[PDB]
């Protein structure tokens, strides 16, 4: 499994409108997405090359003249971080190229994902040295990584799915983290990287403040447990927690390379709390059963966080059968808080 997002695929220039001022720009739309464009780079119908946000695109001034304004420091490279923007009023969200720009993908097709092809890479928050102390070994490859596809590009999929029912639960914004076990051995990862229990390591101080390192003995299968840390010294910390916490949100069956069913998941969260295990879970909402339109499904997103008087990053559907889920994240929220 790669549970990573598409960042740069082939897709098909949508409805183009204009923006009024110096109008050397205009709205593009991307499947679900609104993006601004130069002047005359595409019509409809036309393929280019989406990067959505959160992309890392290294800096290249023959490839990407257009962000050699916008270059960062990142991981020790310079490039840009693809952001939410608002430009004259108009959300922008992601970039969008013309094929001209990509010679070597000329053969490529709609929906091929060329992240790779392109040397695009994931941009993630800044973390501490707490939460990415010593790196003991790679990602195990025998466990999903626990990113979500957003909803903009699952339009068809959500029409597809209506009448299905999902597991509501609110995203929060922290680092992932996962505790595993597989046969004699249990370990304690964070995004990318098998970490290694330093006593300063906030990955491990929180697995063995739940005791979910026990826990993961009392279940003795192959599991991982995959969740979000936060609190103190975690992104500014603004669900105000003293100290720091995991909050479940997956359970991946190792031998059966998938992820447990929101009721598999939710049995074993009440056996280990039942035996003196405290793993905490995501606030879970109520049931939904989806009859909606991704701008109705983005609307909900905004929301309470775990606290109430906190605005939430978004929303995670998971669908009871476990074999599809998606992610909403808030607008408002991304406008807002451009750190992240």
């Given at each position: 499994s790669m549970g990573v997002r598409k960042l740069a695929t082939i897709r098909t220039a949508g409805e183009i409108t204009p923006i009024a001022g110096a109008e050397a720009i205009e709205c593009c739309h991307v499947d679900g997405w609104t993006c601004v464009i130069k002047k005359g780079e595409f019509k409809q119908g036309d393929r280019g090359v989406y990067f959505e946000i959160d992309s890392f695109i290294k800096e290249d001034?023959?490839?990407y003249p257009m962000l050699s304004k916008q270059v960062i420091d990142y991981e020790g490279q310079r490039g840009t971080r693809l952001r939410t923007a608002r430009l004259r009023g108009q959300l922008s969200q992601g970039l969008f190229l013309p094929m001209d720009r990509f010679?070597?993908?000329?053969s490529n097709q709609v929906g091929d994902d060329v992240t790779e092809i392109l040397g695009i890479t994931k941009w993630e928050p800044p973390i501490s040295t707490n939460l990415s102390g010593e790196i003991l070994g790679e990602f195990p490859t025998f466990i999903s990584k626990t990113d979500q596809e957003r909803v903009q590009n699952l339009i068809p999929q959500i029409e597809e799915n209506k009448g299905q029912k999902f597991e509501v639960t609110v995203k929060l914004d922290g680092s992932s983290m996962t505790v595993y076990r597989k046969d004699d051995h249990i370990g304690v990862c964070g995004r990318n990287w098998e970490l290694r229990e330093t006593a300063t390591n906030a990955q491990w101080h929180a697995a063995r403040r739940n005791k979910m390192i026990e826990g993961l003995q009392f279940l003795n299968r192959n599991l991982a447990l995959q969740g979000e840390i936060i609190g103190e010294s975690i992104q500014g910390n603004l669900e105000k927690l003293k100290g720091q916490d995991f909050y479940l949100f997956d359970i991946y069956d190792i031998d059966k390379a998938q992820y447990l069913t929101p009721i598999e998941r939710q049995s074993l969260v009440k056996q280990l709390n039942d035996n003196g295990f405290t793993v905490k879970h995501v606030p879970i909402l109520d049931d939904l059963e989806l009859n909606h339109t991704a701008e109705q499904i983005l609307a909900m997103a905004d929301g309470p966080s775990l606290n109430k008087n906190v605005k939430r990053e978004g929303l995670v559907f998971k669908r009871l059968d476990g074999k599809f889920s998606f992610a909403a994240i808030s607008n408002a929220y991304l406008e807002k808080h451009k750190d992240r």
């Amino acid at each position: 499994s790669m549970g990573v997002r598409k960042l740069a695929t082939i897709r098909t220039a949508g409805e183009i409108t204009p923006i009024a001022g110096a109008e050397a720009i205009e709205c593009c739309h991307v499947d679900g997405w609104t993006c601004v464009i130069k002047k005359g780079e595409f019509k409809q119908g036309d393929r280019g090359v989406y990067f959505e946000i959160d992309s890392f695109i290294k800096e290249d001034n023959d490839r990407y003249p257009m962000l050699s304004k916008q270059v960062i420091d990142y991981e020790g490279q310079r490039g840009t971080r693809l952001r939410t923007a608002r430009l004259r009023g108009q959300l922008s969200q992601g970039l969008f190229l013309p094929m001209d720009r990509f010679p070597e993908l000329a053969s490529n097709q709609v929906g091929d994902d060329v992240t790779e092809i392109l040397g695009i890479t994931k941009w993630e928050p800044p973390i501490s040295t707490n939460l990415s102390g010593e790196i003991l070994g790679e990602f195990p490859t025998f466990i999903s990584k626990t990113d979500q596809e957003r909803v903009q590009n699952l339009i068809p999929q959500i029409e597809e799915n209506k009448g299905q029912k999902f597991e509501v639960t609110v995203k929060l914004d922290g680092s992932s983290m996962t505790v595993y076990r597989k046969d004699d051995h249990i370990g304690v990862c964070g995004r990318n990287w098998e970490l290694r229990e330093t006593a300063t390591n906030a990955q491990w101080h929180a697995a063995r403040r739940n005791k979910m390192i026990e826990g993961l003995q009392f279940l003795n299968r192959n599991l991982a447990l995959q969740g979000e840390i936060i609190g103190e010294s975690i992104q500014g910390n603004l669900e105000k927690l003293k100290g720091q916490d995991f909050y479940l949100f997956d359970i991946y069956d190792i031998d059966k390379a998938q992820y447990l069913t929101p009721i598999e998941r939710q049995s074993l969260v009440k056996q280990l709390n039942d035996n003196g295990f405290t793993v905490k879970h995501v606030p879970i909402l109520d049931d939904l059963e989806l009859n909606h339109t991704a701008e109705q499904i983005l609307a909900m997103a905004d929301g309470p966080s775990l606290n109430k008087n906190v605005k939430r990053e978004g929303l995670v559907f998971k669908r009871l059968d476990g074999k599809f889920s998606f992610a909403a994240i808030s607008n408002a929220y991304l406008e807002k808080h451009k750190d992240r």
